[PDB]
Amino acid sequence: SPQLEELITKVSKAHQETFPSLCQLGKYTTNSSADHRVQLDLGLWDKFSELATKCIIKIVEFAKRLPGFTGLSIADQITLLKAACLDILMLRICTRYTPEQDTMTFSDGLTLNRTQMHNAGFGPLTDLVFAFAGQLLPLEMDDTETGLLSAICLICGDRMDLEEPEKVDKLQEPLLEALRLYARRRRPSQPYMFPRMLMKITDLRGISTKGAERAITLKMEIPGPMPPLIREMLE
């Protein structure tokens, strides 16, 4: 129990230090392609993809702060990151949804409306991702819960090509314990919150599968290759 409390603190801090809260960011906007959907606005794609690269680096930094992660083989660290990074990216941007303005906010404060999210690359996946974001809201997750859920998504022993999947399973166990303890303590009158959170992982995987499908069509629409850390994620 003391060790589980320290794990909660450590994961919470790692998330906050690699992912600013919506409340913390100085929002700004752009007038690019703001009023009508187009196939792709290349200036918005260039900015979006740069922000995605930076957030991948942050997710790697977060991962290496999770207790035990750097005790895994470097190969298994890389396999886990490749398998989960798009899931965690999708979760992160959906936690930055402002329903009253129908916007999402990136880590530099860039705040895009739904049409701009579409035009920056989401394309035909846009409205389904905004609906996922919308349905995250009733859970009223806090940053500790988002951090723990992200860790659970990453540290999962079912990933293909792991060398030591039983070791990965054993690292996930206290994360699961920690999220249930935390979630029930915070909202004892809503005991379905922990299972609802875990079922969001399945939803995220479905959105990330659709995002990988979108990457294939977007590749045809952009003049050069995607950024190298994005290509790492997609392989």
Ligand X SMILES: CCCCCCCCCCCCO[C@H]1O[C@H](CO)[C@@H](O[C@H]2O[C@H](CO)[C@@H](O)[C@H](O)[C@H]2O)[C@H](O)[C@H]1O
The residues of the shown chain that bind ligand X, judged by CB under 6 A, are: 54, 56-58, 60-61, 78, 81-82, 85, 229, 232-233
- Binding partner of residue 147 among ligand X, ligand 184, none, CB cut-off 5 to 8 Å per kind: none
Counting residues that bind ligand 184 (by CB under 6 A) gives: 21
Torsional sign, CA 87, 91, 92, 98: positive
Place of tokens 């990074």: 85
Q: With respect to ligand X, which residue has the nearer C-beta, 89 or 183?
A: 89
Tokens of 51: 């922000």
Query: What is the CA angle 89-125-144, rounded to 5?
Result: 30
Q: Which residues, other chains included, contact 181 with Cβ-Cβ below 8 Å and sequence gap of 6+? A: 4, 8
Binding ligand 184 by CB under 6 A: which of 125, 141, 162, 168? 125
Q: With respect to ligand X, which residue has the nearer C-beta, 58 or 200?
A: 58
- Contact (CB, 8 A) for 48 and 56: no
The C-alpha atoms of residue 22 and residue 98 are separated, in whole angstroms, by 9
CB of 118 to ligand 184, least distance (A): 9
Nearest residue to the partner ligand X, using Cβ = 85
CB of 15 to ligand 184, least distance (A): 12
Q: Residue 111 carries which DSSP code?
A: E
Contact residues toward ligand 184 (CB under 6 A) are 48-49, 51-52, 55, 89-90, 92-93, 106-107, 121-122, 125, 211, 214-215, 218, 226, 230, 234
